[PDB]
Amino acid sequence: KTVLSRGYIDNAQFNPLALRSNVLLMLLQFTLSNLKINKSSTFTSDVTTI
Amino acid sequence: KTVLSRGYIDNAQFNPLALRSNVLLMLLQFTLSNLKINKSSTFTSDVTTI
């Protein structure tokens, strides 16, 4: 319910007519919520079995 | 009962001998009442399935 839904839609509903746009925005938020660098951390040598 | 009817006929009658004039005046009022400009308004789309 990112756009074109608030103000008339019910909490339990979604509007199929505006599906693609809302899906697009949700994916966009998913993408933006991951823009970060993969820092390296400390390491330990393992001695456990295989 | 615009003309020729003020104090000549009863409140429940209409003058049959002055019909043309009264009709003409009534139409004239009808015409003058519609002298307006059809202004625009806020157009919008509907997200409804209809």
UniProtKB/Swiss-Prot annotation, chains A, B:
It is found in: Virion. Belongs to the turreted BTV-fold inner capsid family. Homodecamer; each decamer is made up of two conformers of VP2, called VP2A and VP2B. 12 homodecamers assemble to form an icosahedral capsid. Interacts with VP6. Inner capsid protein that self-assembles to form an icosahedral capsid with a T=2 symmetry, which consists of 120 copies of VP2, with channels at each of its five-fold vertices. This capsid constitutes the innermost concentric layer of the viral mature particle. This is Inner capsid protein VP3. It comes from Aquareovirus C (isolate Golden shiner/USA/GSRV/1977) (AQRV-C).
